[PDB]
From a paper:
To determine whether the altered effect of scMFRV-VILP on human IGF1R signaling was reflected in a structural change of the receptor complex, we performed cryo-electron microscopy of IGF1Rzip, a human IGF1R ectodomain construct, in the presence of varying stoichiometric ratios of scMFRV-VILP and human IGF-1. Reconstructions were readily interpretable from the initial model stage in each case. With a 4-fold excess of scMFRV-VILP (calculated per receptor αβ monomer), two major conformations were observed: an open-leg and a closed-leg as previously described for human IGF-2 bound structures. For the closed-leg conformation, a 3.06 Å structure consisting of the intact ectodomain and a single bound scMFRV-VILP molecule was determined. The structure of IGF1Rzip-scMFRV-VILP was observed to be analogous to previous structures of human IGF-1 and IGF-2 bound to IGF1R. As previously, the overall receptor conformation is seen to be an asymmetric Γ shape. One molecule of scMFRV-VILP is observed engaging the receptor via the primary binding site L1-CR + αCT' module, relocated to the top of the Γ from its position abutting FnIII-2′ in the apo conformation. This relocation is accommodated by hinging around the L2 domain relative to the FnIII domains, resulting in the membrane-proximal FnIII-3 domains coming together, forming the bottom of the Γ together with the remaining L1′-CR' + αCT module. Only one ligand is observed binding to the receptor, as for IGF-1. As for all liganded IGF1R structures, the scMFRV-VILP C-loop is threaded through by the αCT' helix. The C-domain is largely disordered, though the density corresponding to Tyr29 is still present.
Residue numbers in the entry:
A (entry chain A): 1 to 257, 264 to 648, 675 to 707, 741 to 896
B (entry chain C): 4 to 32, 39 to 64
C (entry chain B): 1 to 256, 264 to 294, 297 to 555, 564 to 641, 676 to 707, 741 to 896
The structure:
């Protein structure tokens, strides 16, 4: 049967036995923290063919291979992902290999396989034919690749049984575990699955088939499954479900949950963005006018919001059928998360109180609050009521928002940093121009310590580079020039021109903006300015300047200036390297090269220049004498024994104030009124709006360095990019390594013999070895000949044989691998 | 306009740059320049800085 | 000559000559605005010794040292002062040093030296031996200090001609300039005037002496000077004058209404309560006439001891007191000396930005603030933004009266609100104030005194939780549903304040969870404080909401212990075969006292493929922060946190040819490092570090943070343990036989056999699979002749040394 949701095995092998009735899992299937049960080879689950979301394995002790758990697991669909990963293998002790030898086609996600100290057969898997996005894998830690051995089945037997495929420069047999190969379909079944005996699957199939060209024989479907038939899309009587199957409305009505809903042909737990149920509990949905109106009623009439998580039960809302009492103190992430929880609240039917909310500098987190109905009111008919907010500075951006109060008075008290002009502008737009009077707006305690009037710091000049902005503004001098102590320049990455000052800034010190200070220039002719550096090319920054000033005169005679928020786009630049160049040759003379966009798109990416050049072979291989022992996989033993602060700025302000007053005392007391190496040709091509290309007309098994440069609308001026590069290997030509002529034997003095064979015409790289198997009626003896020995003598000597019906066969080992064994040669030794 | 700090003494020295600055000697028995020219809304005067020169 | 009443050296270096034969200035000394440097500068004045009031230098051009002008200026007595300062050096150009090298004492006055852009000897003067009130100095506007260290004669003449001292806790040479160092003297004159000959001079001495103890040769007198001798108090027929000297009457009788004589001192007019006598019109006699005082500006701003000292001895002040003491450390004692006699302020009193006032009690004997002029809003007593103000006097010893005008109190954080209401009680101003004028919000915000008490009735504890209850407090005024606020903060130690701070945020700041008194009268109010880390000590104090009171004592309650987090960042090494060193860190969350770490280790078998590989087979050896960064790091953080949430619910219960091996276990209690011994050579061991705590007996140790550590190879343990043996074999072949090493490093993967008739040209490979089948290897089909061979075992760790050679022979 089908199983789910979300299988989770968490303590012991006995809990695994939930799986043996499961062939498809409509969930993840975690297995975590299992202690070794000493039941060994028990607890196999061969019924399992598909995991829909993601397989996650953590700390499962004693599990030597997942092929023992899920021998027939064929597809991990990745409909839901574990942080973009569909297969996760973390801290899995004793795990020698992944071993999921029937896993063919992971439909979505990446494969993180982390810190599994004994895990081998990772590099033997060509995930590029299991996965579309190998670049996201993150195979970090595990057993070091130099210590794995990774021998494929048949390799140690000299009878390799697995397929080979190029991953960049590397071309070796592909395997899941020491005994089993990775199953790959022949080239004829283009983008199809196939059965075990090579016969192509039905086009709508996935992974494997019991019988070819049959919709009913699939172990997994691409697109959808219905009554055993794989289907491109659900038959019109049925609806798509959990990313993999078709179920009738009579099924989707019966799932426990208001029940599941049907929309755009698929059945879901809740109807998606912009759609709402027909009415009450009903299966069909309609598009919504705005975000779909949700009532958010609470049995408590007044919902207190006193911590950032206390608003979490709003979670997304449209109409709060009660009253709000915001009370937020501390937390430093407040507005950016209060907007996550409450920004969608369009209507508050009761009153809104903002009391002791010392964290908030702006109520703009209540982004979409269009109405406060005030059907219920606190006391004295108050409907919007803020009290004792030590850091409130703004209510809403009244240049943009049209809040309205249907009934009740507005009230504001003890808001040192929130200006009475701002609360008046609120009442000018909220429809409350005459509800409250006198003491409701006392003006004694609101804005008492706020900069409520500002001159404009006009930007005089701007200059940009790939990583710099140099900006200046008009010379500002308040009536007392002394009280301008510095300018603060606030800049932030602002892709869109809607950023106001209070995008953050909640009273916890640092905020979303970066900021840097400019002292008043000593030379009166020089204009103030800043060089912002460390910026990103082509990105738009919101930059604005504020004058840091004293308050000595009070009575609002302080005039703290602001600049207008200037959106400056840094110059477009040479793009960074195009990330994760990866290549695979589906044929000799061809190379599919794929990559990802550059880490920084330093301009509107126009195209990519792909640049392939051949590479010389000799300077590593041509003298290596491969018929001698390589360095053994020796293991390493363990080794390795044994921004100015607010207080600072307040100190500067206080020292400036004390200097000002003492200069005043100076003047008013002193002054008295009178009474084979070659550089192969480059090749270049331009690819537009496509992060992959098929380089063609190449050589058999030839190493091509592929440079890739991303380009933007500045390419003619600045060049394209620093090359990201991959050394790509073309697929070998079949049979190009088998000897092109009949081998010959010839006599030598004493018991020795000589054998001679011609060099291959177009070898798949250098022929680094020639193996000779020889013996009488049995190839009882091995020998091998280096490339150098052939370049010396042609053939090779066989030493001190015995008379008999001796036989020999020869096999060239090129850089791609061994070619076909030659036809046998018969020879004998004289008496 | 107003002259307060470095500017006030620089202007005063430019006004009286050889005439010199006056001294009280009041015989043991008043807002000042930093008030008439800077701190109050009164504003400074090139025709009143002359009053603080010695003559 | 002794010169007074004060010298304005102004506009002229040629006018600087006025000091040519002055020795004591009975007043201030001003050197002001002289611009004609290169036209004149040549002046020096050795005769100057004492300045009674203060020295002010302002924008003097081209003066490269006051050591040019005043080499012998010895004392500044500060009897009258310039904005708390006895020495002011301001906006001087090319000053380059102070150079007052013989100024051994400055009495009752701070030093400010500001905006002298070339001054390079300001920090090297140990003012602690010049004036007592070093806490009031303002050297802030100095030249940038990037160039002025160690320039003293302690280094300049290639080795010291100087001395060194401590300031704060730093330690440096002390000098005024080059060629001179500060004239300190030994501790035996530690309260005496010293000498140039380093003998302790007269007890009543202040400056310096040339002879060792020759009294009447004190360059400056302590207390009072008279007729060439110092005296602790003026002789019985002499009178104190201008705060430095005694005079016979015929001087104070000849100062151009004449100075009076009273209390043994001579001043401009009789103090409060006294009037000049009839027909003896020199002496003072008691009336009680109150001395009224006034200013041209109807508001006197008091920012300094000077602005207060203009009222010295006054009793009634016509005008408004704008008390503005922003930085006057300890100058409340001076403010008391001046203003502690003003019984009546006719106008308003405004204490604004007066951060130096911890208490208003310096207004001694103040009795009425009549409010005959009032601020905007009709205020007569206005108190704003006084960060440190704690008391308006008005304690149970003296009563104020405010005849007219309202009271205002805003932003006085350390001022108990009980005091501002007690002020209404004491002054009778109950009928004036609004709730907008006296605020419970911004007054009493910090450092509040307290009389009402809330008691912790019961507490309960869990891994992540604290449950706290207290009494149902209510006064006889059963006003409201009194709201109780529980303040909880991580308290690593019990040296914790209340929320008596302005730290709204930063690191550990007192979190506040509000709670309401439940309507059910039986239930004591309680809070389930949650989200608390295991085993952390949290200070909790209850408080009450709207006269009132009700604070609790701080309870340093500790959450119950939990299973520790993983021991972080485990690392390992091997200095020695059969031993490992393992090191880690205290876990991310100890969740208890780290009483001990469990360390378990287990042999991993040699990798199974090593027994299968047949290492003599072929291989090919092919070779050759912005929002986005913060988001990527946060995604990685969540990825780590899910697995921590996985294994922190996992607990370990401590102990009460090759397949598998048993575990080994140790309690290590000292530190985050251990030595594991008696191990197998070159064997991989899983080192499961299990952080544990005092509650292990109930909860168990942490799930292991493993590291796979390989012991170093035992040298001389994988070379063949004996002489190789050989046999002749059929078909011109040899067999080499050799024992397997008793304890090879990991395994023996293969044996190399070097063989040759004279030199070992030829090489043969023997895999473990073949060796375990034949006890050796067959060197097949060698050419007949005399031969030599050597065998090298290649283990999992490296080569064993080539064995003793075997000289076999093949026969033709
Ligand atoms: C593994 O199987 C899948 C189909 O089962 C092969 O086709 C790939 O299917 C994925 C669907 O996960 C396609 O990705 C995108 O899916 C989203 C829905 O999340 C859709 O909105 C996009 O338009 C797109 O379809 C992907 O394009 C598709 N790739 C190809 C080449 O058809 C997949 O190729 C198989 N893996 C391997 C290594 O062959
Ligand atoms: C410098 O001289 C003054 C003047 O004597 C000393 O400061 C205080 O002066 C008053 C009035 O004469 C005495 O009552 C105090 O006892 C003096 N202070 C001390 C600590 O005795 C001052 O001590 C002298 N030295 C320094 C380094 O300032
Ligand atoms: C290898 O290092 C270990 C660990 O330092 C040494 O063993 C003991 O280590 C402890 C702690 O450092 C010392 O207090 C002991 O004195 C050490 N033992 C001895 C006998 O000195 C060990 O000595 C080192 N060397 C070898 C060969 O094991
Ligand atoms: C599997 O199904 C059988 C009946 O087919 C049932 O008896 C058994 O309990 C099931 N086991 C699980 C784990 O679902
Ligand atoms: C609001 O004002 C009206 C009219 O003054 C009054 O009747 C009512 O009680 C007040 N409060 C509410 C909650 O309606
Ligand atoms: C708010 O209403 C005013 C007046 O009609 C209009 O100018 C402004 O565009 C409106 N804003 C929004 C967001 O609807
Ligand atoms: C501006 O629009 C962007 C576009 O999605 C949005 O993310 C952002 O919240 C809006 N407001 C501000 C202040 O940037
Ligand atoms: C940056 O862009 C501006 C656009 O006005 C252009 O004038 C300037 O030359 C550019 N500078 C560089 C270094 O690309
Ligand atoms: C290789 O793939 C490309 C497209 O990716 C295709 O055009 C080409 O024909 C393929 N070559 C072979 C031999 O299948
Ligand atoms: C760059 O691309 C964006 C998004 O496609 C587009 O809106 C913009 O107009 C483009 N600008 C240029 C100069 O190509
Ligand atoms: C200084 O001494 C001279 C004697 O040469 C005398 O005439 C003069 O009055 C004294 N005082 C001043 C200020 O010159
Ligand atoms: C100080 O020296 C003078 C002058 O020689 C002398 O008259 C006096 O006696 C000396 N003082 C003492 C205490 O000897
Ligand atoms: C409390 O004492 C500890 C002792 O190490 C000290 O580190 C800490 O700074 C002290 N905290 C306060 C507020 O005094
Ligand atoms: C924990 O350690 C502290 C010292 O840091 C000690 O006072 C206390 O008694 C210890 N408690 C336990 C249970 O070990």
């Amino acid at each position: 049967e089908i199983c789910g949701p979300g299988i989770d095995i968490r303590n012991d092998y006995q809990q695994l036995k939930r799986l043996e009735n499961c062939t498809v899992i409509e969930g993840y299937l975690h297995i975590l923290l299992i202690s070794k049960a000493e039941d060994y080879r028990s607890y196999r689950f061969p019924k399992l063919t598909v995991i829909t979301e993601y397989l996650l394995l953590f700390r499962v002790a004693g599990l030597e291979s997942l092929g023992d758990l899920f021998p027939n697991l064929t597809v991990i669909r990745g409909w839901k992902l574990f942080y973009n990963y569909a297969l996760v293998i973390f801290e899995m002790t004793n795990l020698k290999d992944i071993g999921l030898y029937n896993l063919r086609n992971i439909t979505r996600g990446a494969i993180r396989i982390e810190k599994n100290a004994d895990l081998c057969y990772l590099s033997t898997v060509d995930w590029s034919l299991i996965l579309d996005a190998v670049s996201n894998n993150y195979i970090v830690g595990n057993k070091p690749p130099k210590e794995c051995g990774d021998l494929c089945p048949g390799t140690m037997e000299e009878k390799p049984m697995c397929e080979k495929t190029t991953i960049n420069n590397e071309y070796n047999y592909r395997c899941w575990t020491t005994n089993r190969c990775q199953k790959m379909c022949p080239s004829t079944c283009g983008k199809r699955a196939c059965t075990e005996n090579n016969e192509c699957c039905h086009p709508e199939c996935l992974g494997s088939c019991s019988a070819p060209d049959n919709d009913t024989a699939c172990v997994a479907c691409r697109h959808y499954y219905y009554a055993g038939v794989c289907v491109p899309a659900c038959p019109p009587n049925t609806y798509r479900f959990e990313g993999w199957r078709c179920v009738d409305r009579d099924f989707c009505a019966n799932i426990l949950s208001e029940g599941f809903v049907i929309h755009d042909g698929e059945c879901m737990q809740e109807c998606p963005s912009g759609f709402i149920r027909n009415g009450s509990q009903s299966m069909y949905c309609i598009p919504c006018e705005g975000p779909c109106p949700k009532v958010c009623e609470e049995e408590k009439k007044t919902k207190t919001i006193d911590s950032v998580t206390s608003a979490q039960m709003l979670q997304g809302c449209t109409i709060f059928k009660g009253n709000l009492l915001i009370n937020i103190r501390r937390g430093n992430n407040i507005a950016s998360e209060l907007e996550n929880f409450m920004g969608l609240i369009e209507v508050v039917t009761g009153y809104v109180k903002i009391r002791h909310s010392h964290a908030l500098v702006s109520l703009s987190f209540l982004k979409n609050l269009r109405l406060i109905l005030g059907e219920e009111q606190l006391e004295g008919n108050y409907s919007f009521y803020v009290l004792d907010n030590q850091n409130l500075q703004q209510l809403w951006d009244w240049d943009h928002r049209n809040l309205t109060i249907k009934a009740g008075k507005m009230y504001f008290a003890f808001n040192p940093k929130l200006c009475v002009s701002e609360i008046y502008r609120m009442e000018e737009v909220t429809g409350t121009k005459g509800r409250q009077s006198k003491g409701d707006i006392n003006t004694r305690n609101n804005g008492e310590r706020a900069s409520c009037e500002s001159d404009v710091l006009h930007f005089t000049s701007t200059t940009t580079s790939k990583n710099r902005i140099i900006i200046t503004w008009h010379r500002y001098r308040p009536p007392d020039y002394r009280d301008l102590i510095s300018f603060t320049v606030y800049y932030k990455e602002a892709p869109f021109k809607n950023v106001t000052e209070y995008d953050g800034q909640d009273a916890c010190g640092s905020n979303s903006w970066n900021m840097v200070d400019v002292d008043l220039p000593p030379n009166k002719d020089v204009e103030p300015g800043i060089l912002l550096h460390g910026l990103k090319p082509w990105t738009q920054y919101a930059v604005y300047v504020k004058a840091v000033t004293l308050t000595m005169v009070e009575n609002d005679h302080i005039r703290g200036a602001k600049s207008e928020i200037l959106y400056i786009r840094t110059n477009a630049s040479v793009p960074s390297i195009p990330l994760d160049v990866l290549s695979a040759s589906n044929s000799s003379s061809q190379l599919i090269v794929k990559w990802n966009p550059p880490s920084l798109p330093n301009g509107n990416l126009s195209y990519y220049i792909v640049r392939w050049q051949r590479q010389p072979q000799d300077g590593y291989l041509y003298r290596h004498n491969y018929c001698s022992k390589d360095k053994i996989p020796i293991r390493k033993y363990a080794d390795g024994t044994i921004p100015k602060t607010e207080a600072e700025k307040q100190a500067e302000k206080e020292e400036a104030e004390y200097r000002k007053v003492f200069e005043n005392f100076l003047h008013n007391s002193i002054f008295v009124p009178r009474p084979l190496e070659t550089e192969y040709p480059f090749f270049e091509s331009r690819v537009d709006n496509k992060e992959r290309t098929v380089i063609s007309n190449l050589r058999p098994f030839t190493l091509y360095r592929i440079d890739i440069h991303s380009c933007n609308h500045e390419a003619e001026k600045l060049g394209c990019s620093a090359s990201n590069f991959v050394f790509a290997r073309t697929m070998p030509a079949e049979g190009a390594d088998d000897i092109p002529g009949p081998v010959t034997w010839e006599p030598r003095p004493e018991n020795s013999i000589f054998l001679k064979w011609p060099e291959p015409e177009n070898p798949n790289g250098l022929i680094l070895m020639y193996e000779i198997k020889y013996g009488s009626q049995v190839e009882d003896q091995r020998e091998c000949v280096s490339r150098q020995e052939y370049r010396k003598y042609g053939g090779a000597k066989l030493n001190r044989l015995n008379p008999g019906n001796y036989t020999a066969r020869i096999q060239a080992t090129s850089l791609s691998g061994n070619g076909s064994w030659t036809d046998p040669v018969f020879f004998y030794v004289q008496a | 306009d107003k002259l307060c700090g470095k500017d006030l003494v620089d202007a005063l020295l430019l006004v009286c740059g050889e005439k010199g600055v006056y001294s009280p000697k009041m015989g043991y028995a008043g807002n000042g320049i930093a008030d008439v020219c800077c701190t109050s809304a009164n504003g400074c005067d090139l025709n009143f800085l002359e009053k603080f020169c010695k003559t």
